[PDB]
CSV table of all heavy atoms in Angstrom, one decimal:
chain,number,residue,atom,x,y,z
L,46,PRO,N,-14.4,-61.3,20.0
L,46,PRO,CA,-14.3,-62.7,20.4
L,46,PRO,C,-15.3,-63.1,21.5
L,46,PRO,O,-15.7,-62.1,22.3
L,46,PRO,CB,-12.8,-62.8,20.9
L,46,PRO,CG,-12.6,-61.5,21.5
L,46,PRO,CD,-13.3,-60.5,20.6
L,47,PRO,N,-15.8,-64.4,21.6
L,47,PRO,CA,-16.7,-64.7,22.4
L,47,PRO,C,-16.2,-64.5,23.9
L,47,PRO,O,-15.2,-65.1,24.2
L,47,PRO,CB,-16.8,-66.4,22.2
L,47,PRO,CG,-16.3,-66.5,20.9
L,47,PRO,CD,-15.3,-65.5,20.6
L,48,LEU,N,-16.8,-63.5,24.6
L,48,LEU,CA,-16.2,-63.2,25.9
L,48,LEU,C,-17.1,-62.5,26.8
L,48,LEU,O,-17.9,-61.6,26.4
L,48,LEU,CB,-14.9,-62.2,25.7
L,48,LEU,CG,-14.3,-61.5,27.0
L,48,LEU,CD1,-13.5,-62.6,27.7
L,48,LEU,CD2,-13.5,-60.3,26.6
L,49,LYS,N,-17.1,-62.9,28.1
L,49,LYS,CA,-17.8,-62.2,29.1
L,49,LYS,C,-16.8,-61.4,29.9
L,49,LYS,O,-16.0,-62.1,30.6
L,49,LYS,CB,-18.7,-63.0,30.0
L,49,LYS,CG,-19.4,-62.4,31.3
L,49,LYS,CD,-20.1,-61.1,30.9
L,49,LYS,CE,-21.4,-61.4,30.1
L,49,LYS,NZ,-22.3,-62.4,30.8
L,50,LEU,N,-16.7,-60.2,29.7
L,50,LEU,CA,-15.8,-59.3,30.4
L,50,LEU,C,-16.4,-58.7,31.6
L,50,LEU,O,-17.4,-58.0,31.5
L,50,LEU,CB,-15.1,-58.2,29.5
L,50,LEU,CG,-14.2,-57.3,30.2
L,50,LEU,CD1,-13.0,-58.0,30.7
L,50,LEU,CD2,-14.0,-56.1,29.2
L,51,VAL,N,-16.0,-58.9,32.9
L,51,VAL,CA,-16.5,-58.4,34.1
L,51,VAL,C,-15.4,-57.4,34.7
L,51,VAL,O,-14.2,-57.7,35.0
L,51,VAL,CB,-16.7,-59.4,35.1
L,51,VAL,CG1,-16.9,-58.9,36.5
L,51,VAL,CG2,-17.8,-60.3,34.7
L,52,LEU,N,-15.9,-56.2,35.1
L,52,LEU,CA,-15.1,-55.1,35.7
L,52,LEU,C,-15.7,-54.9,37.1
L,52,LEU,O,-16.7,-54.5,37.2
L,52,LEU,CB,-15.2,-53.8,34.8
L,52,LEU,CG,-14.7,-53.9,33.3
L,52,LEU,CD1,-15.0,-52.6,32.7
L,52,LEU,CD2,-13.4,-54.5,33.1
L,53,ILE,N,-14.8,-55.0,38.1
L,53,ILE,CA,-15.1,-54.7,39.4
L,53,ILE,C,-14.2,-53.7,39.9
L,53,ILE,O,-13.0,-53.7,39.7
L,53,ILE,CB,-14.9,-56.0,40.3
L,53,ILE,CG1,-15.7,-57.2,39.6
L,53,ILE,CG2,-15.3,-55.7,41.7
L,53,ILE,CD1,-15.2,-58.5,40.0
L,54,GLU,N,-14.8,-52.6,40.4
L,54,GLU,CA,-14.0,-51.4,40.8
L,54,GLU,C,-13.3,-51.8,42.2
L,54,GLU,O,-14.0,-52.1,43.1
L,54,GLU,CB,-14.7,-50.2,40.9
L,54,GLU,CG,-13.9,-48.9,41.0
L,54,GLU,CD,-14.7,-47.6,40.8
L,54,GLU,OE1,-15.6,-47.6,41.6
L,54,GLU,OE2,-14.1,-46.8,40.1
L,55,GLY,N,-11.9,-51.7,42.2
L,55,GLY,CA,-11.1,-51.8,43.3
L,55,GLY,C,-11.2,-50.6,44.3
L,55,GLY,O,-11.6,-49.5,43.8
L,56,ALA,N,-11.0,-50.7,45.6
L,56,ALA,CA,-10.8,-49.7,46.4
L,56,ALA,C,-9.5,-49.1,46.6
L,56,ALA,O,-8.6,-49.7,47.0
L,56,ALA,CB,-11.5,-50.0,47.9
L,57,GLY,N,-9.2,-47.9,46.1
L,57,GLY,CA,-8.0,-47.3,46.2
L,57,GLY,C,-6.9,-48.0,45.6
L,57,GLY,O,-5.7,-47.9,46.0
L,58,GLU,N,-7.1,-48.7,44.5
L,58,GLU,CA,-6.1,-49.5,43.8
L,58,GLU,C,-5.4,-48.6,42.7
L,58,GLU,O,-5.8,-47.6,42.4
L,58,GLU,CB,-6.8,-50.7,43.0
L,58,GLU,CG,-6.9,-51.9,43.9
L,58,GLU,CD,-5.6,-52.1,44.7
L,58,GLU,OE1,-4.5,-52.3,44.0
L,58,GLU,OE2,-5.7,-52.2,46.0
L,59,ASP,N,-4.2,-49.1,42.4
L,59,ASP,CA,-3.4,-48.2,41.6
L,59,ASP,C,-3.2,-48.9,40.2
L,59,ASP,O,-3.0,-48.4,39.1
L,59,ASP,CB,-2.0,-48.0,42.1
L,59,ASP,CG,-1.4,-49.2,42.9
L,59,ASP,OD1,-1.5,-50.4,42.3
L,59,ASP,OD2,-0.6,-49.0,43.8
L,60,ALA,N,-3.4,-50.3,40.0
L,60,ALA,CA,-3.3,-51.0,38.9
L,60,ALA,C,-4.3,-52.1,38.7
L,60,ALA,O,-4.9,-52.6,39.7
L,60,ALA,CB,-1.9,-51.7,38.9
L,61,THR,N,-4.7,-52.4,37.5
L,61,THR,CA,-5.6,-53.5,37.2
L,61,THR,C,-5.0,-54.8,37.4
L,61,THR,O,-3.9,-55.1,37.2
L,61,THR,CB,-6.0,-53.4,35.7
L,61,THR,OG1,-6.9,-52.2,35.5
L,61,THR,CG2,-7.0,-54.5,35.4
L,62,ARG,N,-5.8,-55.7,38.2
L,62,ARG,CA,-5.4,-57.0,38.5
L,62,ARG,C,-6.6,-58.0,38.1
L,62,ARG,O,-7.6,-57.6,38.2
L,62,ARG,CB,-4.9,-57.1,40.0
L,62,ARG,CG,-6.0,-57.0,41.0
L,62,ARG,CD,-5.4,-56.6,42.3
L,62,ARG,NE,-6.6,-56.0,43.1
L,62,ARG,CZ,-6.5,-55.6,44.5
L,62,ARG,NH1,-5.2,-55.7,45.2
L,62,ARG,NH2,-7.4,-55.1,45.1
L,63,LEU,N,-6.1,-59.3,38.0
L,63,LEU,CA,-7.1,-60.3,37.8
L,63,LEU,C,-7.8,-60.5,39.0
L,63,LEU,O,-7.3,-60.6,40.1
L,63,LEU,CB,-6.4,-61.5,37.4
L,63,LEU,CG,-7.1,-62.8,37.1
L,63,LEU,CD1,-7.9,-62.6,35.8
L,63,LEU,CD2,-6.2,-64.0,37.1
L,64,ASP,N,-9.2,-60.5,38.9
L,64,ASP,CA,-10.0,-60.9,40.0
L,64,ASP,C,-10.4,-62.3,40.0
L,64,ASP,O,-10.0,-63.0,40.8
L,64,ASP,CB,-11.4,-60.1,40.0
L,64,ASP,CG,-12.4,-60.3,41.2
L,64,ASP,OD1,-12.2,-59.7,42.2
L,64,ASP,OD2,-13.0,-61.3,41.3
L,65,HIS,N,-11.0,-62.7,38.9
L,65,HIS,CA,-11.1,-64.2,38.7
L,65,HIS,C,-11.3,-64.5,37.3
L,65,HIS,O,-11.6,-63.7,36.4
L,65,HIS,CB,-12.2,-64.9,39.6
L,65,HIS,CG,-13.6,-64.4,39.3
L,65,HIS,ND1,-14.2,-63.3,39.7
L,65,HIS,CD2,-14.6,-65.2,38.6
L,65,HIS,CE1,-15.4,-63.2,39.3
L,65,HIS,NE2,-15.6,-64.3,38.6
L,66,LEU,N,-11.4,-65.8,36.9
L,66,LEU,CA,-11.6,-66.3,35.6
L,66,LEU,C,-12.9,-67.1,35.6
L,66,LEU,O,-13.4,-67.6,36.6
L,66,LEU,CB,-10.4,-67.1,35.1
L,66,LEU,CG,-9.1,-66.1,35.1
L,66,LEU,CD1,-7.9,-67.0,35.0
L,66,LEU,CD2,-9.3,-65.2,33.9
L,67,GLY,N,-13.3,-67.5,34.4
L,67,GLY,CA,-14.4,-68.5,34.4
L,67,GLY,C,-14.7,-68.9,33.0
L,67,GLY,O,-14.1,-68.5,32.1
L,68,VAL,N,-15.7,-69.8,32.9
L,68,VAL,CA,-16.3,-70.4,31.8
L,68,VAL,C,-17.7,-70.4,31.8
L,68,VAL,O,-18.3,-71.0,32.7
L,68,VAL,CB,-15.7,-71.7,31.4
L,68,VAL,CG1,-16.3,-72.2,30.0
L,68,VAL,CG2,-14.3,-71.9,31.4
L,69,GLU,N,-18.4,-69.5,30.9
L,69,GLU,CA,-19.7,-69.3,31.1
L,69,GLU,C,-20.4,-70.4,30.0
L,69,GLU,O,-20.1,-70.2,28.8
L,69,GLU,CB,-20.1,-67.9,30.6
L,69,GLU,CG,-21.6,-67.5,30.5
L,69,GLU,CD,-21.7,-66.1,30.0
L,69,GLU,OE1,-21.4,-65.1,30.8
L,69,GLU,OE2,-22.2,-66.0,28.9
Side-chain angles (χ1 to χ4, degrees):
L48 173 73
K49 169 53 69 54
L50 173 65
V51 166
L52 303 181
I53 301 154
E54 192 171 48
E58 272 317 299
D59 42 34
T61 292
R62 67 204 161 174
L63 180 71
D64 185 86
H65 70 280
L66 297 163
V68 181
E69 183 179 287

